[PDB]
C-alpha cells in the first residue's frame, strides 16, 4: 500500500 507518511522510509521495501 501507499507509504503516504512511513511510505518513505521503506520506500521500496515495505510500506505496509
Given at each position: 500500500a501507499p507509504?503516504?507518511?512511513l511510505s518513505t522510509?521503506?520506500?521500496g521495501?515495505?510500506?505496509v
Amino acid at each position: 500500500a501507499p507509504s503516504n507518511v512511513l511510505s518513505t522510509l521503506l520506500w521500496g521495501r515495505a510500506c505496509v
